Amino acid sequence: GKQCFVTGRKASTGNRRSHALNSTKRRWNANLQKVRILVDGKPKKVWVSARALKSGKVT
Amino acid sequence: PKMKTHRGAAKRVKRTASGQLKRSRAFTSHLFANKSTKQKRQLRKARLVSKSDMKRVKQLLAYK
Amino acid sequence: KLHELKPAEGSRKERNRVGRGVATGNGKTSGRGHKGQKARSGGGVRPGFEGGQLPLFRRLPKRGFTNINRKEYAIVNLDQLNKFEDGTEVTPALLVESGVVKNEKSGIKILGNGSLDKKLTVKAHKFSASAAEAIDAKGGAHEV
Amino acid sequence: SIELSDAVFGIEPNNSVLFEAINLQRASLRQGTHAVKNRSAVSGGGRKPWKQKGTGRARQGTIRAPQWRGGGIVFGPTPRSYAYKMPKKMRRLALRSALSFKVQENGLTVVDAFNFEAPKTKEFKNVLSTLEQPKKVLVVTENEDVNVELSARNIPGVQVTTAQGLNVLDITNADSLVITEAAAKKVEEVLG
RNA sequence: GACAAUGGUAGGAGAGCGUUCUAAGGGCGUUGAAGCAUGAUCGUAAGGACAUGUGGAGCGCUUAGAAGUGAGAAUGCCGGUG
RNA sequence: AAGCAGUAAAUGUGGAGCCGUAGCGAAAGCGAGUCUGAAUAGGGCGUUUAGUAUUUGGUCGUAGACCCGAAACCAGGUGAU
RNA sequence: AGGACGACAUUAGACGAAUCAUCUGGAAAGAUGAAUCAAAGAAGGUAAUAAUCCUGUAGUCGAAAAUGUUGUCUCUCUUGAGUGGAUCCUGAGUACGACGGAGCACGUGAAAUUCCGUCGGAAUCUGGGAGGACCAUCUCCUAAGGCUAAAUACUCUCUAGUGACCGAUAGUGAACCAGUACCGUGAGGGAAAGGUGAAAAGCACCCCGGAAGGGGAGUGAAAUAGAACCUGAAACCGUGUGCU
Numbered sequence: 001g002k003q004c005f006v007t008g009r010k011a012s013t014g015n016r017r018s019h020a021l022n023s024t025k026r027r028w029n030a031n032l033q034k035v036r037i038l039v040d041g042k043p044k045k046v047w048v049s050a051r052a053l054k055s056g057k058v059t
Numbered sequence: 060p061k062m063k064t065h066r067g068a069a070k071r072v073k074r075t076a077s078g079q080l081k082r083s084r085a086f087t088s089h090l091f092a093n094k095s096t097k098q099k100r101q102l103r104k105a106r107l108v109s110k111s112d113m114k115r116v117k118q119l120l121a122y123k
Numbered sequence: 124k125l126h127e128l129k130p131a132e133g134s135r136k137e138r139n140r141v142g143r144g145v146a147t148g149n150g151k152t153s154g155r156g157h158k159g160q161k162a163r164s165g166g167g168v169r170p171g172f173e174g175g176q177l178p179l180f181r182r183l184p185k186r187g188f189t190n191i192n193r194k195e196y197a198i199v200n201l202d203q204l205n206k207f208e209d210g211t212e213v214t215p216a217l218l219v220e221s222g223v224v225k226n227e228k229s230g231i232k233i234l235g236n237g238s239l240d241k242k243l244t245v246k247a248h249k250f251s252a253s254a255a256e257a258i259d260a261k262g263g264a265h266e267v
Numbered sequence: 268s269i270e271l272s273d274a275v276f277g278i279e280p281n282n283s284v285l286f287e288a289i290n291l292q293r294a295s296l297r298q299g300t301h302a303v304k305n306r307s308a309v310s311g312g313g314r315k316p317w318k319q320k321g322t323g324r325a326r327q328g329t330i331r332a333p334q335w336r337g338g339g340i341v342f343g344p345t346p347r348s349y350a351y352k353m354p355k356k357m358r359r360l361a362l363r364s365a366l367s368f369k370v371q372e373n374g375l376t377v378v379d380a381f382n383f384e385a386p387k388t389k390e391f392k393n394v395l396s397t398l399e400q401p402k403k404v405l406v407v408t409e410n411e412d413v414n415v416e417l418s419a420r421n422i423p424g425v426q427v428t429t430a431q432g433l434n435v436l437d438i439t440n441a442d443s444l445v446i447t448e449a450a451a452k453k454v455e456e457v458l459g
Numbered sequence: 460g461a462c463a464a465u466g467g468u469a470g471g472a473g474a475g476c477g478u479u480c481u482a483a484g485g486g487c488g489u490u491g492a493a494g495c496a497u498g499a500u501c502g503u504a505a506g507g508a509c510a511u512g513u514g515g516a517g518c519g520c521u522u523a524g525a526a527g528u529g530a531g532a533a534u535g536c537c538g539g540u541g
Numbered sequence: 542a543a544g545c546a547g548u549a550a551a552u553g554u555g556g557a558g559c560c561g562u563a564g565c566g567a568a569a570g571c572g573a574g575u576c577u578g579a580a581u582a583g584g585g586c587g588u589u590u591a592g593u594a595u596u597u598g599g600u601c602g603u604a605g606a607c608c609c610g611a612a613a614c615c616a617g618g619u620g621a622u
Numbered sequence: 623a624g625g626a627c628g629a630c631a632u633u634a635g636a637c638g639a640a641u642c643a644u645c646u647g648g649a650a651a652g653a654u655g656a657a658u659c660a661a662a663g664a665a666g667g668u669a670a671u672a673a674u675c676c677u678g679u680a681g682u683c684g685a686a687a688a689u690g691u692u693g694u695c696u697c698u699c700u701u702g703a704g705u706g707g708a709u710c711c712u713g714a715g716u717a718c719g720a721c722g723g724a725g726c727a728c729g730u731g732a733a734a735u736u737c738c739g740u741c742g743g744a745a746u747c748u749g750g751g752a753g754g755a756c757c758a759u760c761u762c763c764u765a766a767g768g769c770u771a772a773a774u775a776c777u778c779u780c781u782a783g784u785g786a787c788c789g790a791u792a793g794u795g796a797a798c799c800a801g802u803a804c805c806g807u808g809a810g811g812g813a814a815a816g817g818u819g820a821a822a823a824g825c826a827c828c829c830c831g832g833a834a835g836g837g838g839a840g841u842g843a844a845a846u847a848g849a850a851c852c853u854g855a856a857a858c859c860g861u862g863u864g865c866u
Contacts, residue, residue: 012738014723021729028723028739051740055715062602065171068180076564076587083186104577104585112179116171118601119180125440126484128523131283136598137475142607143529146505153607154470164607187567198563198572226558234563236573236588251572287596290524293482293786295551301787303527307605310795314811319611325534326610330812333608336537336791337813341608343527344787350551353595358552388660417661421673421680434551440483457553 002032004049006057035059065119072108074123080108194229196249201257202237204245212244233258233265270377270451271370275459280364280371287353288361288435295350303343306331311338363458365438375444376400377451383414391418395425398445405441407433409449430454 003010009030016026036045038058048057072080084102091099141153152162161167172178203223207213215231218224224231230248239257246266250258258265306312309331317324331338369375376398383390395404406419406427416427426437430453438444446454 009739012723014738016723026723031740051715060603065180068171070185071180071183073566077589079586081586083183085183088184106585108179116179119171121602124484124522125289125436125482126522128286128289128483129282130286130523130597134283134597138598140528144505148470152469155607156469164605166606170602190568193568200563200573203562223562225556232572234572236563253572253574286523289482291596292551293524296549296786297481297525298549298785298787300785301527303788304794305605311812315611323534325536327536328610330536332536332610334533334536337795340527342606349525351596355552357595362552386661388662392660414661417680421660421663423663431553432547432551436482436551 002030002047004030004032004052005037005046006048006052009049009051062118062121064122065116068116068119069123072120072123074120075107080113080120081105082108196230196232197224197226197228198234199223199231199247200234200236201239201254204233204239204243205241207241207243209242210244212246214246215248218247268377268379268448270448270455271375272455272459275363275455276367276370276375278360278363278367280368281360282364284357284361285364285368285435285439288358288365289439291351291353292434292436297349299347299349301344302346303340304338305341305343306333306339309338359458361435362433362438365435366444366454366458369438369441369444374442375446377446377448379448381406381408381412381415381447383412383418386414386417388418388421391415391425392422395419395422400445401442403440403442405437405444407444407446407450407454409447409453430457 001011009032011027011029013025013027015023017023031050032047033050033053034045035048035053035057036043036059037048072082075081083105086094087099087102094102139149140147141149144150155162168174172181199218204213206221206223211217215224215227218231219227232249232251233245233247233254234251235254235257239261242262243258244264244266245258248267250265250267255265306329312329312331314330315328316330317327319326327335329335329338333339333341366375378398402424404425406415406425407430408415408427409430411429412427419425419427426441428437430450433454
């Protein structure tokens with residue numbers, strides 16, 4: 001699917017429990033954002049997680 | 060495989076020298092305003108399991 | 124002689140074979156009685172609890188704990204000390220090589236059941252208060 | 268000449284340990300490689316063939332059931348080991364009982380060093396004839412002797428061994444013992 | 460040698476017959492093996508022999524060992540035949 | 542016991558260990574006595590110490606567990622001639 | 623990290639000891655006599671049951687060429703420790719915390735150690751972590767970069783060999799020209815079928831019949847051994863008869 005460009009962040013899978021511990025499978029997505037970052041060859045717009053966008057990037 | 064012991068029986072008994080088991084007494088948990096002061100004082104002493112239950116539950120304690 | 128062999132008398136028996144004839148008395152039903160849950164390939168009930176009324180170790184209360192630093196001692200009564208000649212300062216090394224103690228668990232403890240009747244110099248980890256008197260009333264000392 | 272010791276050759280034989288030593292050595296030679304297919308392992312099945320009720324035929328579930336011709340052995344063989352063990356003192360006592368039986372039967376016969384410099388079966392056949400031994404013989408020595416086992420290994424009924432390789436079965440199977448004056452003391456020093 | 464006892468299901472105890480294979484000993488076989496057919500034989504039972512025909516090459520006995528160990532009935536499976 | 546050696550032999554070496562020789566008590570811990578309790582005062586369990594390894598037989602537990610048998614339930618595909 | 627340097631192993635093979643006569647027999651390996659070999663008495667065949675008839679076994683010998691592994695010689699590579707201490711370096715959105723999960727034998731529990739998604743977010747040798755909440759003193763260690771052989775698991779396959787494993791309803795579903803007749807639109811399911819004789823010597827010829835099939839006569843030790851071929855049983859189907 002999608003995944004963070006700079007780092008490798010990607011959705012994981014786990015359980016979701018009720019108040020009686022009834023388990024049911026669910027996902028945990030990453031906080032991906034469409035950001036136009038500046039690589040040479042061309043400035044391209046890619047997925048980047050908001051965790052990598054803090055403190056250091058080109059935009 | 061190795062035979063598995065009963066883990067909830069092993070928390071309620073202990074083996075004497077003859078091989079008899081020393082159990083504890085039921086009816087000593089709560090509601091003490093309803094039991095006599097003599098029937099409360101004699102439920103405080105441990106006793107041995109019977110011949111019949113030893114007939115029944117004695118493989119569950121083959122390692123104890 | 125390999126053509127003339129006999130087991131010791133009373134050493135071997137015939138196994139019993141059910142399901143083979145009525146003369147045996149185990150041929151039909153194989154000693155399992157008539158229709159029931161105890162007469163089915165598979166089996167009966169779990170041992171002890173049956174699914175019925177409340178089991179015995181679910182009707183009595185639990186008790187006590189287990190001490191993690193429980194120290195157990197290898198016991199040596201006084202009478203086992205008689206296998207040693209007079210003098211012969213006894214230590215946990217000589218006491219294991221001699222052949223009285225096998226597994227020095229947390230040390231050795233000299234207990235006082237029996238008669239000493241010798242003049243030893245026992246060096247152990249702990250003494251009983253009725254073994255020190257015995258080891259010192261026949262003449263002799265004891266270091267811990 | 269004669270070389271013996273009453274605590275390895277004067278033992279009253281123990282028949283009850285000798286039987287178990289023989290049966291143990293016999294049970295330990297079995298491979299045990301025998302198997303058979305069951306309902307899980309026979310190809311086919313997985314489909315009820317007659318639809319249960321509504322058909323006059325008996326209700327069935329598989330074409331590989333233990334009753335159908337062609338599939339399903341109920342409790343057949345399976346590859347299992349047969350060897351067992353017994354205490355060391357019982358092993359030693361069994362050997363001592365076998366050797367004492369050879370002595371009491373008047374089987375044992377000590378001789379000086381076997382001297383063969385080149386393998387030859389004529390020589391060994393003649394040596395046995397001179398000593399007038401029975402057809403089944405056990406030639407014992409102190410170590411491996413490469414000219415006493417190369418000879419007397421194509422002869423019928425002659426078995427050659429060493430002092431640290433004595434069985435209870437090979438001794439109880441022979442008729443006579445031809446030991447040397449080294450292997451005699453070697454076995455007396457191992458046992459006894 | 461005298462006295463008594465001996466019906467039996469479920470099931471509990473004991474002693475045994477027979478089948479295939481293995482070890483060791485001792486045997487039989489083209490002057491005819493096993494199998495298979497008949498017989499008016501023996502044993503308290505399971506079962507064991509012998510004679511004749513056939514057949515056409517293997518097979519018992521003793522003492523121990525190990526089991527895919529003995530079937531009239533499962534609207535049992537397969538084959539044959541009413 | 543595993544390991545090592547050796548004919549996948551059967552046979553030596555190996556003693557980490559494991560059961561027993563001492564129990565009692567929730568435990569600290571005392572020791573043929575201990576735990577309770579103010580206290581042997583009495584009572585409970587002991588001092589009953591011959592056990593241990595291998596193995597035939599009976600029974601139980603974990604494995605489908607004496608044999609045959611559902612109405613179904615889940616997963617992956619094959620089907621609109 | 624690229625190359626050059628003689629011994630072994632695999633892939634065909636060769637040599638390989640020692641027996642003759644009589645009886646029964648269609649046939650000798652069997653029985654009866656004598657005799658030999660053996661580092662070879664494993665096994666299979668041979669007209670029956672062979673250490674000495676054949677193929678073999680114990681032992682020894684062999685390789686143009688391809689491959690594998692291996693020893694030495696080259697071919698490379700390549701300055702190793704001890705002191706001194708001013709000061710500088712020692713893996714950062716990382717460690718860790720809160721919320722939601724998972725994983726640890728350990729079910730959120732007093733839960734340490736370890737991972738994930740979202741937010742917040744350290745120190746720099748007086749540093750940083752662990753010793754089952756947490757704190758102090760002691761002891762052990764130095765995360766947030768990476769590589770690595772042996773002991774270990776399994777067998778489509780090749781080379782030898784073993785079995786108190788089956789012996790054609792058994793053993794592979796398949797000893798047969800089987801995953802095939804077939805059966806289904808399809809995915810897929812699935813059988814049943816062994817044996818003449820030592821050697822085809824597998825019936826020249828005559829007779830009845832259109833042929834099939836016989837009856838002879840020949841082959842054979844045997845033809846109720848004639849290819850619907852070892853043996854040939856029970857149910858079932860007949861023909862004759864002793865008593866009723």
